């Protein structure tokens, strides 16, 4: 009937996680700086169809408590791993591998799942985040910085208390609109004390699809936790560099259909667009089928086109 929401030790956290539906399990991986919340249309979709859709808040928001704001350390990708595998064993206890559907940086979190324990994932569906070879010669940072400079977000994330006292007098629910709303394929600037200003702004009837309701289900809920458990997540990149060194070269070996939309500002990192189309990410994900590039679509796919998503993720599931 209802979205069901519990609460479940994990990994050392005490996780909100909220489910519909019985049969197969899929587990939906949110990114930044979102919420189980982001998958409300797609758990409705699979759930009617015979799926157990399952929705986790990540560590550092929503209602899932534990991890210490004031240490990104803890924000790592073994971190990040070490909870969804405790939490499949924790709630998945009879299904040896299961689904899992993942957006941004929760793509990020499962494309590592996939590297360090594929006998968990039955199938993976990735949504705006492709693999990344890692690069040897330096971490994601500094070569984003190299690009884009020091007003690029990646950057202006690193250092704690900056973007938090960016954010602070703009409030919540004006950060997450303009975010949510936004459009244009460069990547976001914050440049120190211009606040929101250096983000150009779409027409407002491209950004129908976002009720004021569910703003400001993503408002209330920032406005409690702050953006520090989020912008940890980056703050971790330089250490996920380092700690990841194991895995070069190792394919990921799971099957995987992945999806981007066309004005996806990830999806115009230079390099990115050859990588994923002329096979340099076939290679690395031998079991990837045919890519999905949705027309005039941003980066919320889930939201901004739900139909599209939630029927490209039951035809996938539904071959196996």
Known sequence: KKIEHKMVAVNGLNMHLAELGE????????????????????????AERGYRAVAPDLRGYGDTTGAPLNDPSKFSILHL????????????????????????????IAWHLCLFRPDKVKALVNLSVHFSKRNPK???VEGLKAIYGEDHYVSRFQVPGEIEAEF?????????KKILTYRDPAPF?????????????????????????????????????????????????????????PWTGAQVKVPTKFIVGEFDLVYHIPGAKEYIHNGGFKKDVPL????????????????ERPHEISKHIYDFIQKF
Do not use: C
């Open 23 to 46: 049969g197969p399990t899929i587990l939906f991986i949110h990114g930044f700086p979102e919420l189980w919340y982001s998958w409300r249309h797609q758990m409705v979709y699979l």
């Open 81 to 108: 791993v070490g909870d969804v595998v405790a939490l499949l064993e924790a709630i998945a206890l009879n299904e040896e591998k299961v689904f899992v559907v993942a957006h941004d940086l929760g793509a990020y």
């Open 138 to 140: 330096m971490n994601k």
């Open 168 to 176: 602070a007098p703009i409030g919540a629910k004006s950060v997450l």
């Open 189 to 245: 600037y914050f440049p120190k004390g211009k606040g929101l200003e250096a983000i150009p702004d779409a027409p407002v009837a491209l950004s129908s699809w976002l009720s004021e309701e569910e703003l400001d289900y993503y408002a209330n809920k920032f406005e409690q936790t702050g953006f520090t458990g989020a912008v940890n997540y980056y703050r971790a990149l330089p250490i996920n560099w380092e700690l990841t060194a």
């Open 288 to 303: 990837l089928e045919e890519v999905v590039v949705l027309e005039g679509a941003a980066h919320f796919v889930s939201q």
